XYZ file of C-alpha atoms in Angstrom:
300
model
C 15.395 14.219 17.418
C 14.834 10.512 16.761
C 15.568 8.515 13.635
C 12.192 9.086 12.069
C 12.335 12.848 12.504
C 15.810 13.101 11.099
C 15.241 10.997 8.001
C 11.830 12.513 7.476
C 13.132 16.063 7.682
C 16.038 15.291 5.401
C 13.701 13.822 2.770
C 11.081 16.559 2.986
C 13.821 19.219 2.926
C 15.331 17.752 -0.195
C 11.989 17.312 -1.878
C 10.939 20.856 -1.216
C 14.311 22.189 -2.334
C 13.581 20.628 -5.731
C 10.046 22.006 -5.450
C 8.631 18.567 -6.093
C 5.049 17.902 -5.039
C 4.270 14.710 -3.171
C 2.107 13.543 -6.059
C 4.900 13.993 -8.557
C 7.361 12.007 -6.480
C 4.877 9.235 -5.704
C 3.754 8.794 -9.337
C 1.207 5.950 -9.720
C 1.491 4.970 -6.070
C 2.857 1.535 -6.669
C 6.030 2.108 -4.634
C 5.015 4.978 -2.401
C 1.740 6.758 -1.798
C 1.151 10.333 -0.850
C -0.085 9.402 2.620
C 2.956 7.170 3.155
C 5.310 9.956 2.111
C 3.431 12.342 4.355
C 3.864 10.042 7.371
C 7.537 9.680 6.593
C 8.055 13.457 6.252
C 6.221 14.132 9.506
C 8.435 11.546 11.118
C 5.425 9.458 12.057
C 6.847 6.579 10.072
C 10.309 5.313 9.303
C 10.953 4.340 5.719
C 11.841 0.804 4.788
C 14.667 -0.065 2.487
C 12.344 -0.352 -0.505
C 10.754 2.978 0.198
C 14.062 4.683 0.715
C 15.394 3.193 -2.445
C 12.452 4.565 -4.383
C 12.594 8.012 -2.768
C 16.341 8.315 -3.364
C 15.942 7.318 -6.967
C 13.186 9.864 -7.491
C 15.161 12.692 -5.976
C 18.289 11.666 -7.853
C 20.131 10.894 -4.611
C 21.911 7.917 -3.173
C 20.630 6.025 -0.202
C 23.793 7.039 1.653
C 22.980 10.686 1.025
C 19.486 10.341 2.493
C 20.765 8.340 5.413
C 23.643 10.670 6.306
C 24.717 9.491 9.723
C 21.520 7.684 10.578
C 21.285 3.927 10.530
C 18.208 1.921 9.598
C 19.742 -1.531 9.818
C 17.289 -3.968 11.363
C 19.042 -6.530 13.578
C 18.691 -10.266 12.926
C 17.140 -10.723 16.357
C 13.983 -8.920 15.190
C 13.514 -11.233 12.246
C 14.022 -14.195 14.583
C 11.366 -12.917 16.950
C 8.980 -12.238 14.055
C 9.590 -15.721 12.720
C 8.864 -17.175 16.110
C 5.616 -15.163 16.272
C 4.548 -16.463 12.910
C 5.390 -20.081 13.773
C 3.679 -19.720 17.107
C 2.130 -23.102 18.033
C -1.223 -23.937 19.597
C -1.564 -23.861 23.329
C -1.532 -27.685 23.195
C 2.094 -27.852 22.081
C 3.651 -24.830 23.806
C 7.228 -24.009 22.962
C 9.386 -22.988 25.957
C 8.064 -20.139 28.130
C 7.179 -16.856 26.340
C 3.661 -15.877 25.279
C 2.822 -14.087 22.049
C 1.989 -11.147 24.235
C 5.417 -11.218 25.806
C 7.211 -11.579 22.484
C 5.289 -8.660 21.002
C 6.005 -6.350 23.932
C 9.670 -7.468 23.770
C 9.781 -6.709 19.997
C 8.508 -3.187 20.673
C 10.775 -2.505 23.642
C 13.765 -3.556 21.605
C 13.000 -2.435 18.112
C 10.126 0.035 17.828
C 12.216 3.106 16.960
C 13.687 1.345 13.965
C 10.708 -0.480 12.510
C 9.293 0.708 9.214
C 5.572 1.083 8.594
C 5.094 -2.192 6.800
C 6.682 -4.228 9.633
C 4.502 -2.464 12.170
C 1.380 -3.277 10.226
C 2.588 -6.861 9.898
C 2.968 -6.986 13.688
C -0.517 -5.603 14.305
C -1.867 -8.216 11.964
C 0.026 -11.024 13.716
C -1.047 -9.843 17.117
C -4.691 -9.934 16.235
C -4.708 -12.795 13.761
C -6.061 -15.640 15.933
C -8.972 -13.338 16.815
C -9.493 -10.754 14.044
C -13.075 -10.012 15.216
C -11.575 -8.860 18.498
C -9.946 -6.174 16.348
C -11.789 -3.212 14.806
C -9.584 -0.689 16.522
C -7.900 2.046 14.460
C -8.577 4.699 11.778
C -4.810 4.972 11.399
C -4.524 1.229 10.865
C -7.254 1.149 8.227
C -5.530 4.081 6.511
C -2.146 2.317 6.485
C -3.582 -1.069 5.451
C -5.551 0.479 2.634
C -2.506 1.946 0.796
C -0.447 -1.125 1.438
C -3.225 -3.296 0.002
C -3.402 -0.895 -2.978
C 0.201 -1.717 -3.564
C -0.233 -5.440 -3.027
C -2.911 -5.719 -5.684
C -0.362 -4.709 -8.309
C 2.102 -7.453 -7.505
C 2.527 -10.787 -9.150
C 5.008 -12.166 -6.700
C 4.089 -11.855 -3.017
C 6.353 -11.561 0.002
C 5.690 -12.750 3.559
C 4.448 -9.278 4.388
C 2.330 -9.157 1.264
C 0.642 -12.374 2.281
C -0.056 -11.089 5.793
C -1.677 -8.024 4.320
C -3.686 -10.317 2.068
C -4.820 -12.287 5.127
C -6.089 -9.056 6.634
C -7.912 -8.327 3.380
C -9.566 -11.735 3.622
C -10.644 -10.758 7.059
C -12.205 -7.661 5.557
C -14.312 -9.973 3.418
C -15.580 -11.794 6.563
C -19.365 -12.081 6.952
C -19.912 -9.820 3.954
C -22.586 -10.491 1.391
C -21.566 -7.673 -0.909
C -17.973 -7.599 -2.126
C -15.831 -7.219 -5.243
C -15.683 -10.767 -6.617
C -13.410 -9.713 -9.443
C -10.808 -8.493 -6.949
C -11.189 -11.575 -4.780
C -10.746 -13.749 -7.834
C -7.602 -11.923 -8.927
C -6.157 -12.110 -5.443
C -6.915 -15.838 -5.188
C -5.370 -16.561 -8.535
C -2.246 -14.747 -7.550
C -1.986 -16.427 -4.160
C -2.422 -19.789 -5.859
C 0.411 -19.000 -8.193
C 2.966 -18.293 -5.477
C 5.950 -20.576 -5.499
C 6.436 -23.048 -2.691
C 10.058 -23.125 -1.568
C 12.048 -23.894 1.559
C 10.906 -20.986 3.685
C 8.680 -22.380 6.443
C 7.625 -18.960 7.685
C 6.438 -17.964 4.268
C 4.806 -21.354 3.778
C 2.910 -20.967 7.025
C 1.498 -17.624 5.984
C 0.584 -19.001 2.581
C -1.127 -21.934 4.290
C -3.256 -19.812 6.584
C -4.168 -17.744 3.543
C -5.324 -20.818 1.690
C -7.478 -21.769 4.656
C -9.033 -18.353 4.684
C -9.786 -18.593 0.972
C -11.409 -22.026 1.454
C -13.481 -20.733 4.303
C -14.628 -17.775 2.230
C -15.484 -19.987 -0.704
C -17.576 -22.190 1.582
C -19.320 -19.104 2.869
C -19.955 -17.858 -0.696
C -21.012 -21.207 -2.082
C -18.375 -20.601 -4.695
C -16.454 -23.813 -5.190
C -14.635 -22.967 -8.337
C -10.985 -23.872 -7.850
C -11.657 -25.209 -4.341
C -9.662 -28.388 -4.906
C -6.900 -26.295 -6.396
C -6.749 -24.579 -3.042
C -6.856 -27.828 -1.082
C -4.115 -29.344 -3.187
C -1.963 -26.277 -2.696
C -2.461 -26.414 1.077
C -1.419 -30.055 1.017
C 1.648 -29.196 -1.045
C 2.618 -26.675 1.593
C 2.100 -29.160 4.395
C 4.252 -31.678 2.599
C 6.999 -29.179 1.799
C 7.416 -27.817 5.303
C 6.085 -30.899 7.116
C 3.291 -29.067 8.866
C 1.420 -32.260 9.754
C -0.489 -30.768 12.644
C -2.263 -28.785 9.937
C -3.314 -31.786 7.897
C -6.582 -32.733 9.646
C -8.062 -29.310 8.882
C -7.378 -29.872 5.238
C -9.308 -33.144 5.346
C -12.090 -31.264 7.029
C -12.049 -28.916 4.022
C -12.374 -31.862 1.690
C -15.279 -33.040 3.789
C -16.981 -29.715 3.429
C -16.433 -29.761 -0.290
C -17.960 -33.212 -0.643
C -20.783 -32.108 1.588
C -21.763 -28.723 0.356
C -20.856 -29.031 -3.289
C -20.601 -32.615 -4.373
C -23.338 -33.419 -1.857
C -21.780 -36.814 -1.221
C -22.392 -37.379 2.496
C -20.558 -40.695 2.269
C -17.305 -39.136 1.027
C -17.860 -36.245 3.368
C -18.020 -38.663 6.241
C -14.965 -40.521 5.058
C -12.934 -37.275 4.910
C -14.056 -36.370 8.366
C -12.932 -39.833 9.451
C -9.470 -39.386 7.975
C -9.235 -36.059 9.765
C -10.288 -37.672 13.015
C -7.952 -40.549 12.603
C -4.982 -38.324 11.774
C -5.672 -36.101 14.739
C -6.062 -39.197 16.885
C -2.846 -40.702 15.715
C -1.172 -37.268 16.216
C -2.497 -37.213 19.786
C -3.998 -33.766 19.692
C -7.133 -34.930 21.424
C -8.754 -31.527 21.661
C -8.475 -31.298 17.886
C -9.809 -34.861 17.581
C -12.844 -34.225 19.740
C -13.458 -30.970 18.021
C -13.479 -32.623 14.651
C -15.790 -35.401 15.833
C -18.140 -32.716 17.032
C -17.694 -31.174 13.587
C -18.807 -34.364 11.903
C -21.872 -34.457 14.071
C -22.531 -30.796 13.375
C -22.586 -31.409 9.636
C -25.041 -34.281 10.021
C -22.674 -37.133 9.238
C -23.008 -38.864 12.556
């Protein structure tokens, strides 16, 4: 009997001894949903610290009592590998030897039996992030993402994990003409209000989120708050010194001048700053790509 089975059985056993329905325990779903609790009690999922804290409080127990002998401590090495996955650099500035593929398999081989549901979803998102179209793969995943996104849309302060879930939501909006604009607007507002501090990992996820929002706004021809987005992206870049990201921001400005301000001259100038920065960063693939971008937009 593994960790998940033990904790799950303990929790279900205690809940049923109090004759508490799943719905009663889960309340409004903000901290735990019925399907989450079900996966925990079937030992399909391990609870996280937050979950366990909620469950213990609801049942009137202590976390120690629900844990018994079992240990759910997640080793620092996992968080280091996750951080390295998030900060994973382009193939033009490779760090050391290991691929993302290798790091992900290594994270599973070392830590799978002790990873809670949220971390696993975060990992699936990271794995598939550079190519989210290449991913339309699980009913189980959509089911897990859906409740976690339900929870996310109640929060005012986001975590790293929250933001990765939000990035996957943005991907849900991809290529879609019909969508809930009110939800998208609330999400955007809340992302834009997140504090920028000294966590580079967080700041990276926030950045990629901002790019996704900009892209979506370009696709929707909705340029309200676009410069708010751009400025926030730039504030991130400055705070964590992510200068390899800066040309793409200038490209965004270009697009804004082009498709909204319709100022081909400024558009062209922004492209030129992007090209020059890439050039003087010596990512030549990026430079060439941006030049081709300027031609593509008719500013050649």
